[PDB]
Amino acid sequence: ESADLRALAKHLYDSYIKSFPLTKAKARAILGKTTDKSPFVIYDMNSLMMGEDKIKFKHITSKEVAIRIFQGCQFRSVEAVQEITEYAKSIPGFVNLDLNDQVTLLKYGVHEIIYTMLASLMNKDGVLISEGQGFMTREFLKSLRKPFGDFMEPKFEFAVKFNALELDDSDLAIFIAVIILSGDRPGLLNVKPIEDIQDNLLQALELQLKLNHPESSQLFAKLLQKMTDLRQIVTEHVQLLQVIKKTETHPLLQEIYKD
Amino acid sequence: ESADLRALAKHLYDSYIKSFPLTKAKARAILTGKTTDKSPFVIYDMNSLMMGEDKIKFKHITPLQEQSKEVAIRIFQGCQFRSVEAVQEITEYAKSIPGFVNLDLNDQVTLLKYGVHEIIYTMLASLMNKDGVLISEGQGFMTREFLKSLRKPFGDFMEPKFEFAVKFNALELDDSDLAIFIAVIILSGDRPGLLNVKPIEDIQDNLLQALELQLKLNHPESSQLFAKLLQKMTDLRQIVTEHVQLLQVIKKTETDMSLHPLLQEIYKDL
Incomplete structure (x- = not known):
């Protein structure tokens, strides 16, 4: 019944709160009033350099700033992937799936999930970095050299x-969760169970949206159609990655952050 | 009320039958073996193609020297004008979508500019099965295999x-x-360049409501089909692009073959 769908909804939520440090609620308060710890604003080359200094960076140390930002974005992408992999393991039924299938779903669902959540740390003027300690302006990012100026x-x-x-x-x-349980990923050895789970997640989401957003007419449908926006954001990112790789192309560092 | 939603469904279904000669119902009866219709002539090779001309009448593109005005090109020019027809048919259909003609002239053109092809492949499916596709109103049937064996660039279009x-x-x-x-596809508020997105989103919202009702009523047992169908809109975007790149390869592999103006205009695309 309804209950069953809500139970699943509460579960994924609690699981989502444990797996992800910076939630959308927190990020919003930061982006949002909650004035008493405003993030360090990076909107300048000097802002950046003071930032790397002042604020905390676990990924670095004459090498374009542009190239050191893009790399950073990647380093952070790899962190999120572990957070996502842990959350996926809480989705009822995900572990019982063929181990290879689990790997393929994660492999193709990671970018989509990464960009979906990135929006939680974004606004039209900038994005939260250093897991909320900072805020890199949109203008500063768009301001980077040729290929790197149009990557965010x-x-x-x-x-x-x-x-x-x-x-x-x-x-x-x-x-x-719905995005992870995508039955159309290439190489899947057993689509039914995956599809059987996404179906159950889709009902939970639909009810969740309806109870959570009564007034928001047909929101379920609008969300599902935003899933194409992501696919395009993903296809489009691997393309710039192509370009770049014909700019830049440590050996051990390259192995960790492969694609 | 859902009664307004069913009326809307009834209305669109009516305009649909009126605007599209070859429906899915007719397409399937011809493909499966129903007496309600006749059998198609099958084009599975170079010679069936030859014989195809007499029997199957298209006039679109029939002979132009040996396979030199290449069977490939000939088939392509044909598939071009069929596309042009579909566009006109989808255009006529769109006019019946409540509210669509009441929008800015600029947006109407932009909605069709981007919705047309997505609609063409959605509907083209009704004329296909893992083995081939109906052509010339269903009079003919061209094999998936004949089509995949064409000149280096055209054996990849279909x-x-x-x-x-x-x-x-x-x-x-x-x-x-x-x-x-x-209808939903056309009323896409996210099309590039839309002056007014709101009037469009309010119309699609109702259509989404109508489709949502339609599915659960017409397909009682097919769970979450509504979400399943919406997600299909993604495979459609990739069909389009995938094809535009090919049109770009064509535009210069064959500088002697012409593209229909209609199709050309709709192409500063996505």
Whole structure:
């Protein structure tokens, strides 16, 4: 009954809160009033350099600033992937799946989930970095050299539209689960169970959206159609990655942050 | 009330039958073996193609020297004007979508500019099965294999269409479903360049409501089909792009073959 879907909804939520440090609620308060610890604003080359100094960076140390930002973005991408992999393991039924299938789903669902949540740390003027301690302005990012100047923009554009839906953490938890249980990933050895689980997640999400957003007409449908926006954001990111790789192309560091 | 939603479904289904000669119902009866219709002539090779001309009448593109005005090109020019026809048909359909003609002239053109092809492959599926596709109103049937064996660049145009058609057809949707779905596709508020997005989103929202009702009523047992169908809109975007790159390869592999102006204009695309 309803209960069953809510139980699953509460579960994914609590699981989402444990797996992810910076939630959308927290990020919003930061982006948002809660004035008494405003983030360090990076909008300048000097801002950046004071920032790397003042604020905390576990990924670095004459090498373009542009190239050191893009790399950073990647380093952070790899952290999120572990957070996501742990959360996926809490989705009822995910572990019982063929181990290879689990790997393929994660392998293809990671970018989509990464960008969905990035929107939670974004607004039309910038993004939260250093897991909330900072805020890199959109203008500063768009301001980087040729290939690197337009690498976050497509993401900011998606964020503005996705955020229009005004979803919250409890909404997003079920949503990212649906994305992981995608039966159309290439190489899947057994689609039925995956598809059988996404179906159950889709009902939980639909009910969750309806109880959580009575007035928000057909929100379920609008969210599901934003899933194309992501696919395009993903296809489009691997393309710049192509370009770049014909700019830049440590050996041990390259192995950890492969794709 | 849902009564307003059913009326809307009934209305769109009606305009759909009126705007599209070859429906899915007719397409299937011809493909499966029903007496309600006749058998198609099958084009599975170079010679069936030859024989295809007499029997099957298209006039579109019939002979132009040996396979030199290449069977490939000839088939392509044909598939071009068929596309042009579909566009006109989808255009006529769109005019009946409540509210669509009441929008800014600029947006109407932009909605069709981007919705047309997504609709063409959605509907083209009804004319396909893992083995081939109906051509010339269903009079003919061209094999997936004949089509994949063409000149280096043209043997790649239809495959991702078949690829999509097989999974999409797995949904077992009928004409009453597609009419509302096709409507939704057109009323896409996120199209690039839309001056007014709001009037459009309010119309799609109602259509989404109509489609949502339609599915659960027409497909009682097919769980979450509504979400399953919406997610299909993704495979559609990839069909389009995938194809634009090919049109770009064509535009210069063959500088002697012409592209229909209509199709050309709709192409400063996505």
